Amino acid sequence: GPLQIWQTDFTLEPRMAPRSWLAVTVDTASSAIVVTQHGRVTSVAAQHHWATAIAVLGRPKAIKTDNGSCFTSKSTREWLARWGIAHTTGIPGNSQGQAMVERANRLLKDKIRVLAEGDGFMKRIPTSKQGELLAKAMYALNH
Amino acid sequence: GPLQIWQTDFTLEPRMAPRSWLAVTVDTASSAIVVTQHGRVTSVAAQHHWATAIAVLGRPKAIKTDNGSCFTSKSTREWLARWGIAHTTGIPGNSQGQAMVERANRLLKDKIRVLAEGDGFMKRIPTSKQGELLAKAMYALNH
């Protein structure tokens, strides 16, 4: 739709190392999730994530995040303005701007663990298998 | 929907080198496009592409391709059977199974060129900028 409001954060998932930082977006009205893998939490990683999320879900009206450096930076402020997307920040875990994405963090990590163990991976997923496993987890949660 | 029929092919786009092989899927009923970048045309690259496409569009009922090696291989036949997705092959360019995806190849390449030149890239896109540019092209065509 034309009035989406997203919540975005980062969560660490060592099953996906070396690119173990998962950037996670939930669309607040639909609950759809987009997830991407990153080697580090940086302003540019957030921006790469949102570029992917726009290609999957469409362009949102606003994004809610916490007040960490990758969200409060001049870089990210300009990227969001470039796209015409509004942005509000708050404290880590604030229920208003972040509780839904915290729940998606946990749903994703549980699903990644179940799929991985099912394929016989009890610890880190082999690098060559990670992309398809992450995409299967996203498919499964969105169904 | 639950009855999608896709057409998939590969097209070479040197603006995106070194990962210049674009895997392209169109959903035949909706005309939505998914595109991913690959360094080589292989059975596994097709499979990585379709894993992404399932996370974006949902699981299709069938996929139409040509009869190249990456589509007729025992590997790809098993991957598709694993997912419960039916598959038909035909001759390169057959209008029945491939004309729509050939049109998406051309729409994508034109859009990539327009965006790239707009950002001042007259030849290859800088590697660090390619992911977001490809995702912008996919967004723009699907809108």
UniProtKB/Swiss-Prot annotation, chains A, B:
Mg(2+) 3 binds at residues 9, 66, 102. It comes from the Viruses. Residues 1-143 form the Integrase catalytic domain. Its cofactor is Mg(2+); Mn(2+). Binds 8 Mg(2+) ions per integrase homotetramer. Zn(2+) can also be a cofactor for the nicking activity, but not for the polynucleotidyltransferase activity. The core domain contains the D-x(n)-D-x(35)-E motif, named for the phylogenetically conserved glutamic acid and aspartic acid residues and the invariant 35 amino acid spacing between the second and third acidic residues. Each acidic residue of the D,D(35)E motif is independently essential for the 3'-processing and strand transfer activities of purified integrase protein. Homodimer; further associates as a homooctamer. Catalyzes viral DNA integration into the host chromosome, by performing a series of DNA cutting and joining reactions. This recombination event is an essential step in the viral replication cycle. Has a strong preference for using the 3'-OH at the viral DNA end as a nucleophile. This is Integrase. It comes from Rous sarcoma virus subgroup C (strain Prague). The lineage of its organism: Viruses, Riboviria, Pararnavirae, Artverviricota, Revtraviricetes. The gene is gag-pol. The chain holds residues 1336 to 1478 of 1603 of the full protein.
